[PDB]
Each structure stands twice: as structure tokens, then as C-alpha cells.
Amino acid sequence: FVCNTCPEKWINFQRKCYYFGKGTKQWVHARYACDDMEGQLVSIHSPEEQDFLTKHASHTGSWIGLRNLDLKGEFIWVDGSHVDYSNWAPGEPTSRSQGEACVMMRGSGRWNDAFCDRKLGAWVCDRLATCTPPA
């Protein structure tokens, strides 16, 4: 069981593929853009995964798959999974009480809560890597 094959223009890390996309998008349109590529906005679940993303991240910032779902107060990844790993900037997301709901990744890799209608130049998609057959 060796799964590290990724489509063209995707970078592998462990058992996932990652797409570092470009072009100005609001969070909801970045979300559609990943769905359109048979993926989804990235979910982050370890220090190791964050390291990898931080290395390939855009300095101008980028959308990730975490949002304050239906403004209920709890942050959930687009794939349905809960927050275990977190890499918040200092004070975040408590200092964000003016209606910020969508989470972006800075150049430093740190997460900050943003207004969902903010237009960012970058956004990250993920998906499972495919495996080479028992050959």
C-alpha cells in the first residue's frame, strides 16, 4: 500500500495531494474552485502538515478549508472534520468578533479569521493521493 501519486500540477505530502492555486477569489469562490478540481479547500491536522503548507504558502495570504459554520461559534473544516490541530495567530479567533467567519493562512503559516467576502490572491486545495497497484 503505497499512496503518493498526485495529478498534474499537484504536490504530494504523505498520503495527500495539494494544489496551491492563484487568482483573486472570495472564500466561497475558492471553495467552488477546489470542488471543481475534484478536491476541496485544504484541511490541516498536524504540525507536520502545517510545516509543508507553510513552505509552499503564498506571502500575500491564502484561503483554507476552515470556517465558523453557520456563525454558530464553532470552526469546522469543509470536509466535516473537527478542529484538533490549530495554528492560530496570537489572539485569534477571539479578537475577531465583528463578523469574520472564514479562515485564511498568512505567509508565516499562521491562521487568521477573515470576512468571507475578502478577495485573496491565493487558495489551497487537497485530495487523497492515489496508490500504485501490487506490481
Query: According to the entry, how was the structure determined?
Result: X-ray
Is 113 annotated as ligand-binding? yes
d(CA 120, CA 103): 11
Is 54 annotated as ligand-binding? no
Q: Compute the Cα dihedral for 8, 10, 14, 15 and give only its sign.
A: negative
**CA 74, chain centre distance (Å):** 17
Find where cell 476552515 sits.
66
Cβ atoms of 22 and 81 within 8 Å: the answer is no
Q: For the chain, what is the radius of gyration of the CA atoms?
A: 15
Is 112 annotated as ligand-binding? yes
Q: Compute the Cα dihedral for 79, 111, 3, 37 and give only its sign.
A: positive
Is 94 annotated as ligand-binding? yes
State the DSSP code for 85. Answer: S
- Identify which of 126, 119, 127, 125 has the alpha carbon closest to the alpha carbon of residue 61: 119
User: For the chain, first and last CA: distance in Å?
Assistant: 11
d(CA 133, CA 5): 11
Cβ atoms of 102 and 116 within 8 Å: the answer is yes
Write the CATH number of the domain with boundaries 10-129: 3.10.100.10
Residues composing the chain: 135
d(CA 134, CA 8): 23
